[PDB]
Symmetry: C2
Subunit: 137 residues, 2 copies
Amino acid sequence: GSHMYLSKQLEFLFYVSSKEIIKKYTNYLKEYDLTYTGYIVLMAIENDEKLNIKKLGERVFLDSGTLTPLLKKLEKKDYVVRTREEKDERNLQISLTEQGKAIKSPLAEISVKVFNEFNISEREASDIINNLRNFVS
Amino acid sequence: GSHMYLSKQLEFLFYVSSKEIIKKYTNYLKEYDLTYTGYIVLMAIENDEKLNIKKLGERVFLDSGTLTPLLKKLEKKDYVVRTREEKDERNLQISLTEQGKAIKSPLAEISVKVFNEFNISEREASDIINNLRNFVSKN
């Protein structure tokens, strides 16, 4: 009732919620040699798209400290291509490779599998969506 | 139907709410030279508790990869200490120091400030709480 108690409950429940979700993603993704964050990046890059490391970090809310080594990892696995620009070799363009393009869409099956494990009704899921949408406004 | 649709919305919204939340905690934690994960570890350890890096890792959903460096960093700040119980020295315990249990007092003020920023009603907050409590409870 006090905002102190509600805030501690919100803190706890958002933390555990997101961590339980991520743990399930990590389990499904391990056989793809992917982390949850690597998954998020591949899904965020739109297939015919070329984009800057800074624009990608904004879309996905990661700083260059995290993205940079992640991209090299993805580049090693041949899911992303990191092409240095002609004039400024510092500046990098990021795009999906052919297999990076392909493994999206088996990866697109994973979200259904993760959330079905929580066994909530469509109604409960719609309530959570409406809760969180209003929350993110 | 709607399972594919609903799962994408849920994924997105849990991802973005977590980023928005952590961003606000990070702001308030600058003062204290603590990372968000640092804050979470300090609050998770009850003032007079001893526990394994395994068990602490369970609680805060962190593996040794990430916890090991975190603990040594908190230990050099003098907030935590690592000890082995004489009954079984194989068990490496972690517990809070005196000044590690101390500054948990001003840190405990942060959560109210963070969630106040979203400007939701007590009814909305209570409903979020009830819905997430239902979600988490089946693990």
